Amino acid sequence: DLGKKLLEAARAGQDDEVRILMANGADVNAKDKDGYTPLHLAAREGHLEIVEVLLKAGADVNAKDKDGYTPLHLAAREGHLEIVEVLLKAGADVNAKDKDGYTPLHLAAREGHLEIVEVLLKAGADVNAQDKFGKTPFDLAIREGHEDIAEVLQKAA
CATH assignment of the domain containing 147: 1.25.40.20
Q: How far apart are CA 43 and CA 143, in angstroms?
A: 26
Amino acid at 56: K
Q: How far apart are CA 100 and CA 3, in angstroms?
A: 29
Per the structure, the count of domains in the chain is 1
Backbone dihedral angles phi then psi of residue 83, each to the nearest 5 degrees = -65, -50
Segments forming the whole domain that contains residue 96: 1-157
Solved using: X-ray
Q: At a CB cut-off of 8 Å and minimum separation 6, what does 108 contact?
A: 76, 77, 79, 116, 117, 120, 137, 149
Q: How far apart are CA 109 and CA 24, in angstroms?
A: 40
Cβ pair 56, 64 in contact under 8 A = no
Q: How far apart are CA 11 and CA 39, in angstroms?
A: 9
Amino acid at 40: H
